[PDB]
Amino acid sequence: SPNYDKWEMERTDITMKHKLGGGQYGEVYEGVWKKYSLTVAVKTLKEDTMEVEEFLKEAAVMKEIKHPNLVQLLGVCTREPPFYIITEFMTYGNLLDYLRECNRQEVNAVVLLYMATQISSAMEYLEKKNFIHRDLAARNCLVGENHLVKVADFGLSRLMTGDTYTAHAGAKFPIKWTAPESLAYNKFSIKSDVWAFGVLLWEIATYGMSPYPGIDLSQVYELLEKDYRMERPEGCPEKVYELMRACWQWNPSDRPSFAEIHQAFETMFQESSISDEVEKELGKQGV
Numbered sequence: 001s002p003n004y005d006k007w008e009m010e011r012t013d014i015t016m017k018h019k020l021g022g023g024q025y026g027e028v029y030e031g032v033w034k035k036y037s038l039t040v041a042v043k044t045l046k047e048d049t050m051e052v053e054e055f056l057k058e059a060a061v062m063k064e065i066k067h068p069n070l071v072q073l074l075g076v077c078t079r080e081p082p083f084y085i086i087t088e089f090m091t092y093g094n095l096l097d098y099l100r101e102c103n104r105q106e107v108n109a110v111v112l113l114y115m116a117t118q119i120s121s122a123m124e125y126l127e128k129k130n131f132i133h134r135d136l137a138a139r140n141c142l143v144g145e146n147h148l149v150k151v152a153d154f155g156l157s158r159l160m161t162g163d164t165y166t167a168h169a170g171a172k173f174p175i176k177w178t179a180p181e182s183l184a185y186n187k188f189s190i191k192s193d194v195w196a197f198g199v200l201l202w203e204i205a206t207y208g209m210s211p212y213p214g215i216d217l218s219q220v221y222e223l224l225e226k227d228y229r230m231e232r233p234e235g236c237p238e239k240v241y242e243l244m245r246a247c248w249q250w251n252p253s254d255r256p257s258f259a260e261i262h263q264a265f266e267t268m269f270q271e272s273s274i275s276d277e278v279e280k281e282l283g284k285q286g287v
Contacts, residue, residue, distance in 0.1 A: 007063060009033075009075040011084065016042060020093065025139075026055075030089060033074060039089040040074050046082035053168070058085050058153035065131065069122035071142055071152040091145050096138035099208030107147065109235055109285035110272050112204045115141075115149040116240075117265045120258065122151040123197065127190065127258050132159035134167070134188045136196040137177050138203040162190040176211045180224040181252065191252035194261070198229075198247025205233035205240065207287075235285030239268050 017030035020041060027044040045055045062073035062085075077084035092098040095115065099107065119141060126133065133140070135155035143149050155173065159166065165187040172178045172188075179195035181187050199211050211230050212220060229248035232241045243264045249255035256264075272282055 003078060005059075005063065005076055005078065007059075007073055007076050008078060009086075011077050011080075014040065014042065014086070025094070031086070033086070038074075041087045041089050043085035043087070044082055045084075051170070052083070053170070054155050054173075055083060055085060057155065057157065059083075061131065061153050061156040062087075065125070065129070067122065067125050068148075069118050069150045070125065071150055088144070090142035090150075092143040094139045095141035095143050095149050096203060096208045098143040099138065099204065102207070104207055104285070104287060107207075109205075109237070109283045111147050112285070113237070113240060113265075113269055113272060114147075115204050116201050117269045118149050119151055119200065120197070120262055120265050123193075124258050124262055126151075126156070127159070130159045130162075132157055132162065132166070132188070132190060132193050133196070134171055134193050135173055135177070136193055136200050137174055138200055138208055139174070141200070159190060164189050175217065176220055180227070180250075183221050184225060189252060190258075191255045194247050194255055194258075197261070198244055201240070201244045201247060202230045202233060205236035205244070209233075235287070237268070237283075239264075239271075243268075 013034045014031040015034060017032065019029045021028040027047055029042040029044065031040045031042045032038065033040050043055060045052065056078070059073070059076045059078060062071070066072055071087050073086070074088055075086035077086070123133065123136070133151065133156050136151065140152050140154040141149055142152055155171065157168070165185065167186060167188040171186070172182065175183070177196050177199045179192040182192045202211055203209065212223065212228070215223065227250045229245065236244070243261065246256050247261065
């Protein structure tokens with residue numbers, strides 16, 4: 001069979017539970033895959049099916065990639081019109097929703113920088129293999145136990161060339177995460193995804209606050225096109241802000257690579273990562 005998947009397993013082997021985002025995250029449910037007795041996340045695609053392209057693409061990428069910092073496929077069911085995408089159960093939900101509802105005393109600056117390190121590592125796997133996310137965001141990242149964050153699919157595609165305008169019409173969901181270049185010309189590149197990563201860095205440092213909050217959506221386009229980019233989050237280190245602002249560099253040719261971004265995280269997280277040379281802790285972000 002041409003649409004067969006060894007990842008495709010019997011739906012009957014899963015007992016569904018509570019919906020994890022049936023309200024405003026799609027038709028997402030909790031389940032348990034009986035033959036392993038492990039709790040799972042189940043995406044159904046029955047009702048509105050606004051983006052069959054994007055959910056079916058999630059299955060396609062997860063079969064071509066596997067890493068603990070990319071949401072790992074547990075199975076699928078694409079043999080049936082109500083398409084299912086089965087993944088791991090992440091305890092704390094989306095990174096966006098977690099940070100907004102988390103205890104900032106526990107989930108402090110030091111973990112927040114570490115999330116950005118895990119995510120830049122995750123993206124580096126994709127970029128190495130010529131995959132692109134083009135839609136990178138805290139809502140498109142997940143968090144589980146041991147403060148573990150991982151990047152997800154959500155419009156994850158193959159970059160291949162990244163030779164400008166590499167897209168498929170609806171190649172974005174969140175407008176405030178979409179680059180000025182991508183708003184004006186609908187053009188995506190690896191540098192347009194670097195913008196989305198910068199907005200994600202902002203989200204993490206602001207405990208999940210929305211980019212450019214309180215300014216009108218019809219004005220978002222205007223300001224981003226006039227080279228506007230978010231300011232330093234309160235409690236965010238200067239060193240991280242240099243990186244963050246660089247991800248929002250106006251010229252794509254002057255904008256940093258994932259190589260340069262990774263080295264920036266790697267040096268900063270070995271000021272914090274030592275966790276031994278610094279006695280009596282290091283770094284306190286209040287609010």
